[PDB]
Amino acid sequence: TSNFRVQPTESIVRFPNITNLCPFDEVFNATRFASVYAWNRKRISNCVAD
Amino acid sequence: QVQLVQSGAEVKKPGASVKVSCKASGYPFTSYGISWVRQAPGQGLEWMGWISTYNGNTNYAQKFQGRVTMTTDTSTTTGYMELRRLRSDDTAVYYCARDYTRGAWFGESLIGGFD
């Protein structure tokens, strides 16, 4: 007559971790900020953009 | 919960070197650097070392400019420290801390302290 099958109940997601976060705190929480004419430019790569 | 574990007491004699390790857990190891302070028995605190846990850059004071060396391992998130040329004035207690005064990536000074 037909085919029988069961269906999922819940759902799960797994991802590795949140490690070596990008240095956003260093840029935002710098003690002394430069002037507008001499704005400090930094390059951020190879990390997690939280 | 941020937890820091230090090694045991050392009974090293003058003319030898001391190796001490600090272990950190419960927080992002790379996000912050590692600082180490000291206190003589009966005196105030005395900073000795700082190191960024990202690029391996290290900072020392003038008193311990050429007396200590340090290494860090990100595989287990541990800090190994070698103190050389012991003297009779080196009996004290050393403490591990999470530095929030200097940046881990670029070394930019931050607003904070050992939390």
Where do the structural domains in chain B lie, given as residue ranges? 3-115
Contact (Cβ atoms closer than 8 angstroms) between residue A42 and residue A12: no
Output the six-digit token pair for B110. 């931050």
Residue A30 is classified by DSSP as B
Output phi, psi for A27, to 5 deg: -75, -45
Output phi, psi for B102, to 5 deg: -130, 140
Contact (Cβ atoms closer than 8 angstroms) between residue B48 and residue B114: no
Name the strand (E) or helix (H) holding B38. strand B33-39
**DSSP, residue by residue, A1-20:** -------------------S
| Per-position b or e across A4-19, b if 16+ CB within 10 A of its CB | eeeeeeeeeeeeeeee
Verify whether the Cβ–Cβ distance A32 to B106 is below 8 Å.
no
Method: cryo-EM
Output phi, psi for A40, to 5 deg: -80, 125
The answer to whether residue A42 neighbours chain B at the CB level (below 8 Å) is yes
Give residues with Cβ within 8 angstroms of A33, minimum separation 6: A40
Resolution in angstroms, to 1 decimal, for this deposition?
2.5
Assign 3-state DSSP to chain B and report helix, strand, coil percentages, each to 5: 0, 45, 55
Domain B3-115, CATH class in plain words: mainly beta
Single-letter code of the amino acid located at A50:
D
Verify whether the Cβ–Cβ distance A30 to B112 is below 8 Å.
no
Q: How far apart are CA B70 and CA B84, in angstroms?
A: 11
Contacts of A20 in chain B (CB under 8 A): 28, 30-31, 54
